[model samples]
Target chain A: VSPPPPIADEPLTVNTGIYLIECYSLDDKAETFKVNAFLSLSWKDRRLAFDPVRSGVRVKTYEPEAIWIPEIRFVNVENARDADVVDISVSPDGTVQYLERFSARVLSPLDFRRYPFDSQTLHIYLIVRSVDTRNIVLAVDLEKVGKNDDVFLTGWDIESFTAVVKPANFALEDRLESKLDYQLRISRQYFSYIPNIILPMLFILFISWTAFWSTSYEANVTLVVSTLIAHIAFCILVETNLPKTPYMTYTGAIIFMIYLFYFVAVIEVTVQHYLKVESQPARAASITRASRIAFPVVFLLANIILAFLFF
Target chain B: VSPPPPIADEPLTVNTGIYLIECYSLDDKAETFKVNAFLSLSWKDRRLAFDPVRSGVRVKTYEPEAIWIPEIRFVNVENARDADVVDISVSPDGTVQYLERFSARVLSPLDFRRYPFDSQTLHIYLIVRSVDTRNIVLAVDLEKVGKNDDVFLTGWDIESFTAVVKPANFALEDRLESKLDYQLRISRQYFSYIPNIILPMLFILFISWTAFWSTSYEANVTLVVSTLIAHIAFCILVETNLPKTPYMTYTGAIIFMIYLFYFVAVIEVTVQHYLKVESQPARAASITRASRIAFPVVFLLANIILAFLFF
Candidate 1:
């Protein structure tokens, strides 16, 4: 049989930061693609090059045995040197355990992976070489996460990263933009493994937030209750996908905190709603700063501290 | 060893409308037991029994090696049969291949069990027969999957047979309660293996119902967004516990329905609140009935349905 025309080789991309990842597509269909990654900072095959972990790619399905690659694309970088490309393998689960405390003797090719660097600045690049024509796009981007240590607690990202979304996205190839002052990167790595908790917490707070405008106590309670249902639904979703652990996951902690907040919010709404009913207070009168600020103020901060704070 | 209590002489239980079960206690903690079983039923075993091609229960875990017997006890029928104690056994999880096609396997085993029938009714008596019983209260209490017929559908109590719930005191010589009025029987046998889904779904809806009264769009938006997040979380949680099926689970379908409703509520609140932004319309002066019915209607339904709805 005649050989099918040589499939084009797509560009290879590896984003380096805390949640370092790389993806290589033979074609843009993303099928038959390869992804090399280390969600953990302690992974071993720190090639510092622009190639994805070839062995970690998923041939098909969302099974963890295949590489768990997210849909992220190339961001152009400026004035950066091309780093060496590294080829690596991982065990079935498509994870690279980063046990930094130990030496290299403990590394395994099947399940775990690693990527260490000698420099603080990450060397990441996207090389888009088409499988059909072998044409590739070599693009590089860098990201960093830090806060003013002098500040008492500007440390944590909240329960959900979306809460403190001060996201900064700029083309690395844009020289003028890259030189801008005080541009903080949204470090996906910092919050990569957000505990499943945050989603539930956010869900409850969302429902509770809407409850204040409810014309009646029953109305108020219904919205709150629905949100609670959604929160719990989220809790199940998160719990099922997450690895079971004694300690609360970042996502779990965030969700729990959110749930507690909503529970309190419900009580407040119920009691105040009763008071409003007894007094025959106008619906306009129910509006209060406390109800408005309850979750966004309390939980946003709670999540922020939870995500970024050490303790 | 006084010959293990004379091998439970008699037909352990009758197949009355409600299957009453009993578990002999080996200790003091057994007497301190109380349970409101949220039975998740599966008719697969019964169906498989009917199917001539399918073989009998392929039991595992709580096995008898040759014959699988659950660590449970039973009582006599109401009208005619001899008073013989029958020991019953349900097949383990693997039986899903044989059983799941018919119905969900039971998730929560009955705890607070009682018996009073002589022939017509079947009473299930259950207690911690050992001090080392691993799952104390971690097991689920109740669950229902929305209005879906195949999921958690309705409460069940056998006609002509009574099931009563009470504190299980295994130390006494097995007393039975004649008051079968409150005997907890699953309306449907299909959802017995899928009880926990109710807890998570209700929890989320509870939060959403509370959202109707919150004064601000931001809060409302946050809750809705969080609920979406929570929805994702639940998706994960269910995925982890359940066998990875390409089909949507009855529980997931209900949750998605709930989330979709929540999304609609959020959008409505956002638009309505936006409309009132300039007018700051008084709650009493609201134009649409949607505002009023949204919370009261949903909250009332979530609770009512989830409360009486059997696992």
Candidate 2:
């Protein structure tokens, strides 16, 4: 089959619409998401035009091989989509409507700076390569683009599914190509992380500060060392849940800061023990009292600073 | 249209099958899951039969409203399913094949006694009611009973989708009913929970035991109390993620036992502080030394008992 001759000195426009059926398997580490949707396309084909009275049928159905179709493909998909043709209908005016159900794993980058409390905009790029006979341009069909009411992505709240009406027209490898952006906006469900990771982490850090309330070196060593080990375990736990990124996340910053607090606590405990051993009981007592206040105060202040910087 | 008259004095057999296209939103708290699938049904209706040579068509297509269809409904669904008829084909001998695509939220109960390390058998029950004209029976068509390779439910690994070959024959509301069970077996993805909830919880409990090596009443108070509060927070966190069940879970047993450990530590700390204040330094020293060994040994034994009982 050959492309239909152009009516005017302009590129042929292929109207496109994506109706989402199911959304699942949003992998954070792999930066991929799987989707099942219906891709609808419509375009004028003068070669297929017919008269209703002579044909005795208002609409006609034809196999895909009987007509010309634009070479439409996804720009950001990991592999070619698994598609099944659903229907093909041609109106009396030569307008052809094509519908196909497809499934694909889409590759989209994520920003985890805010993490846990993060919102992300995921994208699916649709593109068409212009053929030798004519240049093809893509346009969104607003009426046909939508998502099913039951389309649910676990662990996320879907905000919206929309398409950029305008296509990005550019030349690729000596051929004209047109692309459209379909965006899915979603936010993470962060309620569980607060109690699971955040609050427990804070409690352990507070327990380590209890060393300042005593003058016994043996007791202080046990307190600081034990909680320090717990903090290290939490750091490993947090890192495992998230993908490795060059930039740090909000929780990552807080976890790293807690390590510094533990290190500083150790130094103070060592200093307090040495002073008491040298028979400087009065100086050791004063330093312990000062530390009792300084430790918590600095912790609270540093937390407020971190929160401000992240939020 | 009424059902075709049965030739023999027997119930009409309606063969059915379900092909899963999408499976998602397996909510643990609600014990619910959503599914999108093709429901295929086959039956004999001699009234609609016609010779292919006379009709000039090997298979005849008819609208759903033009023929008799068994009123098939799901027993475990939250609401009436959303369905759209795809095709209705009739053979020369009046063998009818009906297909429809549907989406529904299935309400199936879950067992959480070993949650996070648990396996679940989710169900979809299909049933048909007898009419005044004739009794109806259901049977599974094995050839069409299957799931799509792309069926992905987040946070779980799907093991299999199979149906029970035998249908339950019983009387409901003074009428004969046939029910078929479609089972979906799946296991939890527990790797994240090990680091996120389990280890962090264990670490905090271990930190509390560090107080046994200390004689400073002030420092011991901080270690035990701070960790106890964190355990309380973890309890609330875990409860929120699960639904109210009559039986205790494996993780629940461990969490409750840790509380006992914290309480005992508090009592020991009090006794040591009082003995030292009364100038009984030898007694206090001996008690502290014994506790350093006792607390950890008891904790390990208790953990072993819990693991053996649960696993």
Candidate 3:
């Protein structure tokens, strides 16, 4: 038991820690998401080492209370259902490793401008409240943090996971304390929204287009009105599944454009009907011919404009 | 001193604790809401008491760490900024009171079926992690837990604030925990919508009605087309101002109804023009006369049906 390397003044870091996500849930109403994971941490405690031959032991595991343990907690925890000391190990070099399993539900603000095309980043913050950063540096093992596919929810995929360190400065009435923040950055997969929401909308827009082919004024009106009603229902359907924001969304813009197309198509047919009925056969023929090409062009152009608006 | 009255076996309770909301905000995009407030709690601690005559002290206030304190934390905290221990006090009888100010962002799931007319509930949970209900009972002051006005966001009004206690019977866990849930129920405001959204839609609907009054076929066509375009714009405006949900809102129904009216009006005008052109003036005149009365009645009937679907 040589002196603990003169008790280095620099902070200790658990650089080899890893965590695995068991499940994730996003609560839109609370503007938060929860990540349940089995987390681990390791650091070298130089004072506890012994010669392997002399002790006849290469490694040992002890109950948490049998050794000095760092008091650690998730900084952004909402309700931590489970936090238990799972493993405490000592190696021949006095290297100490501590592992704890945690189920943390954190609150993260989401950005939904890309919405169905959006990807969300969730952060898990770990800090030892009683320890000073001046004596402890934060680090994490990024390799084992991965999604459990069997337990994952539909419509999202886990993209990436990385751990980073940051310094937290706290000021009080007389002094300031420095603490380390070891954050787990988890990026999840976001897709499948295209088929569920976007596809139905495209179909609705196509329905509006077919209304232009109706020969009779009554038929055209019936088709356009029914399609518009269906579009309105779709708008509501799309919105109910997504979070509400003041910013215009791509899906919302598409619906708006569909409404415009329906409006324009009905008007064209009405004018054509009026002209034909009033014996202005030439004028009616020209308007119908013009609209046959104009409607789709406007639909395409409107979507192009909307792309600029959102992107 | 009198041996601290044979320490009660029951959980300590802050039966007189109170929390008042200073303000609230709803972020539909994130599906969460925030509450800013002053929260209070107290419990009897017989061991903390002192006699004024013997100790020469009647009461004292100290920084939190000097006495035993519950390691309590918000179980539902999202953004828990400024959760500072502002005041702590002790009395001659070991009764301790602690007051803390908090600005919490809570995850509140919104039901948008009623949408702009929807009401939301925000929940804040407080619990002691390792403590059980058998030792720490929960309660609220009830009387002082209220709003202070000015801080409430526009477009909504605070409806009520209530605090209730429940047991945490978690599975596989040994402890039956005690938890306090503080809820804020806020109702939405819809008057400004009348002028900005509903009025514009009504104006468009009225313009569609007047298309029947047009003396010329082209006049009716022009009027109906313009009215439909205006209605389309209003649809975008309405959707932009409200959250998207799957169920049709009153405003959504109104817009759908308007689109139908405009479509039908244009067709009726077209048929009238056609009949007159085909040397059937009498037939056209009758159709116009019938529509002049029939359209409004149908409009009223449709809304009545819509009301049933929503209310």
Candidate 4:
């Protein structure tokens, strides 16, 4: 765990090519990269962190320090066995040195069960090291980013990874490679409260449902029309909320599908009312088999067919 | 017309790497390798192209042109001014080499009256040149990747892209880039179903609401549940049909939200029924006031609030 920090006061700037790390792995930082082969201390984190959302949340600049990474490799089930363990050695690649590993399992999700975690909250920890001075870099939003589906784990909360619930004892977080350490705390339940998750839908459903109570066909029609409009509006609202796609989401498709029903229902209700007023009274026989017997079945069949399209 | 047709070639050797073409940009592929660049080649219908989903998928078998890539660079877009315009290009490190100048009015939609289109199918031109011998690779899907959201131009179909309009003037065949192209296509549309586009959605709508008519709430509940289930199923299905994603699809999110609404609606209906059954009939006013009137409104508000969390 100990190596003298890099003597340089600033981070060493290396071009895009990969750089070798003195130490390869840390169990504690196992939640992301598969193999933490070598460590890189980048002081640029202080000067270069960007706020993706223009949050203007910036980190304070830090002085530099030289710290060398310790040699290590990630461990996990199936690889923690004695036979899986291999002798570790340092190899010098020209002036640059690296800790080479025979084989290693990437460590991610190393510290979930540590804090008193319920179904609601999520926890995360992160540390970045500067490549030149080996000084630590304060990672901004590393925790928040980790929670996003784009960052990797999706539906990761409450669900076990790969069906394995390897509960962590409120203990020391294992290092994935070593230059970094991160613990994530996430609250999946509360995501429902996030404005994007709630607002547009509320408007779509409530504002649109207002038509259901109108006395005139115009009101009912308006209600249904507004519902349809709301449905479309909600689709657009949710469209911005999610990734663009060709195939539909169960949530999204269902929403559209419901509107279709509401549409037919409203149209039918309106037509029936008009028909009844025009004649003495409306009879089921007056409606064609298409609208009378077929509409509902057609809708059902549509659902079945569409559902099959789901996958 | 023929150079002894490159018989169905084995997977483009990744290690050996295929001769990549750079059509639109002015960057050298050898210097800067970027993702999302278009790879193009000319083909005369049958022998000229193949789908990666089928047997003809290609891979980069090699690394540096000499070692992995022998050589690579942008085939100037303007170069087409002189010859049959066909060159594929990868983006570079600093700036991208765009194919057509995106001048404000360069290719703006002409007056529709001037260009009457009734959907008669026509092959625009498929020209592809190789990077090595300048020989055509014959793969067209990668080239399809280059086409923007000009629905009628460039892409093959609309029903497949986003459930946008299935324009009478065009039909998009499912190429390897179907999902990706379709998504970009849908995004161009306002996330609405085009006329006669994805008719099966009617079936989906029918079934979703059929749940409403079934003996009890089970019908609506199950239908909505089924819609939810279908959406989840589709989320995986359409995903496999196209490129993988780091986040949920916009359509998928909309679909899921639809199901969430359906679920809440079903629950509200269920609660209303329960309250009606329990009342002494006299207090029904208060129950209906709170249950029917208040519940939907409050939930709708919640929906609006949650939706804001997405974008």
Candidate 5:
């Protein structure tokens, strides 16, 4: 492969844009999101200029391999494939345009502390290699890039995007280089999880609290323990559905707290039973009354505290 | 790079070797692992070398930046740099030897479901670009590399190493390419986790089993409920320490089993109390005796089955 012709002495600004086709999977373990999209690179090439208005010719085609194009690589790409080239053209007024649709699985470091209610920023870095910012500039004009309405992911909503051009001197061992960081900030659509996981888990917790009103210790213990077992399934369902992380997320902490409350209620049932067995009906009744109110109050208070701490 | 030389018309084998210095960090988010090491690439370059042994001229130096040296780029590298080159030499028979200490963070698509017990192959591919395999062959002599004793890491163990040369055609859109893949298969050292997590958790499971032996329902509930509380803490600790994954892992299953067993034991206490309340001491005594043996036996059996299924 022959090298490109000498680049212009002044900074050559290249305009870039992307249109989303699909956002397939966001993997937490690998910390990457895959997308299929169209990318366009356009620049002014004076050598290719022609009289468009007189000749009535706006576009022409050429073999891209022989052109003197700037070297561009995805800095955060884990695995990528150039699937197809729908079009490549040059316009009469010294403008060279290249368009291609490709598949890319790129890295997006994720933090899930407020999971189930968290927002993530996924960005793709188109790094211009072996060239300093002085020689070239990558521009993303807001008018050139925006969301396509057809690009809807099931569990996420597109929140916003911003273009960032900065020196990525971290590479090249200090040889000046630059990258175009196009970032997409997305927020999770939490409506389904709230009803499916949150409501049912809290419902089970409150049902176990109803054991405090039951006079039968057998019924009380059974109700509390059964609620505990149900939460096991709830916790597992939540865990298996999302990415794993080392820190306890807001949802994880809430599930864990519910387990503690149920266990504590069981202890209360046993304590009341012990006093009744010892013939202290007044004391047993008093403890039961206190627990009936205390369990619900504490459950509410603990969750409020946890929400403040994590959310 | 200015288009490479027209022709070196024969297969020139380049021998390479490395001595590992340190592994900085393995970043899952970025899909890269950083390493600091010494790398040597030596090949016979007639223009650069002379009869050094006979003439007593064992060395020569040149600016590494200006050479027809192989234009090598890491196919999976996120970022890489040669920190400093302290030495370069030429052998008597036109063998050019270049040695440098470099830092690199390269990608290795890692799956960590069985993490802390998982083994990974860490390979650094030295690619010879701008030329096909026909023009230059990368070879690794058996005598050139072995495990460096100085390679020590806190939570991992060196397992084995091997060098391989293969085509890496996936990099370019279309064209055959080859690289020397020097791989080291390393296993995770889980010595501390076995005792810290496994033993302590099993200890609490057996301790909760003691609830069946308690004659007082109050004591049985207390012991079992308290065990449940303790394990709530345990589950949080384990969950918060490991990388998150969507599927259930062996450790997650084990913790779930412990929770199930504790809740089931609490139910046994309630069942026995119900029988006694109905004036059935004989049946209550019968169930109590059976539970004392069944709880431990069943607990042991369930774990064995889980081990068979998960481990």
Candidate 6:
């Protein structure tokens, strides 16, 4: 079978729809998701047209090899989709309806600046190449595009599944290409992170601040150093769970700020000890008292700034 | 149609199978999981038997309304399952095969004793009540009982999905009843909890112990007190995220023990200050030095004991 002949000078429009059956394995680090869906394609082929009165059946079923199908493919997929044709039906007037069930791991980039508390739009690009005989364009069939009521993605709240109805047409090499964007909007389930990551991280930082309340240099060193080591371990743990992004994340900035606080705390501890050794007990006590208020105030203010910047 | 007459003195045996298609929304607090699966039932019905050659077909298809199906129901479900009959086929020997796709929220108790590191066995109880005319017994079909590769419960690792082959037969409402247990085994994803709860709680307790290195009563008071308060906040935060259990969890035991450590540290700080006031600096110094080793050793030992008891 060859490409379907164009009705006139206009490109042939292949109406498309995707109905999600199952959604799973949304990997944050890999920035990929596995999806199972019914992909429906509709086009017209005058070559296969028949007289309804002469034919015994109103519609004809044909094997995929018996007729032409536009060479459609997903652009942002990790590999070619695993697809199985379900049905190929031709109407008496020459309209063809094709349906297939496909499973694919879609590769969509993620923005992690506000991650874990972030919402994202994941994309699936549907594309078709123009053949030598005819130019093909893709279109959205809004009536057929939908998700199953049972469709779910673990660890995420699905917001919407929609498509950009307008197709993007561009020249690729010597042939014209048509592309459509399908978006799945979702938000992270962040309740688990509060107790597991955010609060624990905050509690450790507060523990480090206890160094300000102590006058004994030895005790102060143990206090700040132990908590700092724990903080470092936490940073490593968090980094391992997240993808490496060029841009700084909201949590990353907070983690980095905590390191500075720990460093300054060590300096304060050293200065207090030095002042006492230099016979300035009153001055040392004054600085120690001042830090108890200063550290917390600055920390709260810095967090507000970071939150404001990110949100 | 009425159920086929059973052989002399024998109860009808309905073979059952469940093949999981989707598993989601495993709620720890609610102790429930939503499932979508194929429920298959097979049984012999002698009245429906026919000669294959005479019938012109080896297998016959019939509407569910046209044949007798054992009234099977899920015992542990929150409500009656939402099910749709997919097929009804009868072999020439009158062996009826019925299949339905069902969605249900199954209520299965969870043990939080080890929590975050806990493994659970979720149950789906298949049961059949005896009709006045005939008794029906449930049996498992091992070959058909399984889960899809894509079946996932977010934040958990699914270990196995299996059925208990033998059914429990007992008297109910002065009538016979048979039940089968289908189990889904799963373990928690505990990596996030390590950094979030366990390590943070340990760090706070360790911070409180730093008071053992200091002689300053005011500094010692501030050290233990602040960490204790933070520990209280962490305890509350953790409690909010977990289901309330009558018995103490491993983490709960550790949390409760840390409070005792904090109390003892406070008493030691008071004792040290009192001794100094009484001009017993030497005695105060010895106790403070001894405590630096005692707190950590006792904590480690207690953790070992708790882990042993729980595991």
**Top TM-score model:** 2
Better of 1 and 5 by lDDT: 5
Q: What C-alpha lDDT values do all the predictions have?
A: 0.34, 0.80, 0.61, 0.31, 0.65, 0.80
**Candidate rank order under TM-score:** 2, 6, 5, 3, 4, 1
Query: Candidate 2: DockQ?
Result: 0.08
> Measured by C-alpha RMSD in angstroms, how accurate is candidate 3?
11.2
For candidate 2, write residues B173-285 as lDDT tens digits. 33588989999999988998888788888888888888877877868777786676676656546544565344566775775567567767766776677678778989889
Q: Give the TM-score of candidate 4.
A: 0.28
lDDT value for model 2: 0.80
Model 1: how far is B31 from its true place, Å?
A: 50
Worst 10 residues of 1 chain B by lDDT: B96-105
Query: Which one wins by TM-score: 3 or 5?
Result: 5
Pairwise DockQ winner, candidates 1 and 4 = 1
Where is model 2 more than 4 Å wrong at Cα?
A237-239, B1-40, B43-91, B96-311
User: Considering summed lDDT, which 10 consecutive residues are worst modelled in model 5 chain A?
Assistant: A167-176
User: Positional deviation of B180 in candidate 2, in angstroms?
Assistant: 14
Model 1 global lDDT (CA atoms, 0 to 1): 0.34
User: Could you tell me the TM-score of candidate 1?
Assistant: 0.26
True contacts kept of 3: 0.00
Kindly state the fnat score of candidate 6.
Answer: 0.00
Instruction: Classify candidate 6 by CAPRI docking class.
Output: incorrect
lDDT of 6 by residue, B27-70 (tens): 77899978877787889999889996778655676767788888
Q: Candidate 1: where are CA atoms >4 Å away?
A: A1-204, A240-249, A280-289, B1-265, B270-311
Clashing pairs in 2: none
**Error in Å for residue B56 of model 1:** 61
| Model 1 Cα lDDT, one tens digit per residue, A1-311 | 11112224323322223221221111112112122222211121222212236644331112122332222223333323222111123333433221001000111011001100001112223222133222222222222222221111011211211112122324444221111111222211222122223333343456567655544565566666666766666555443322234454554465567667768777767776766767756543544445676557776688578757423
DockQ of each: 0.04, 0.08, 0.02, 0.02, 0.08, 0.01
Write candidate 3's Cα lDDT for B25-59 as tens digits.
Answer: 66765455666677677778777878888887677
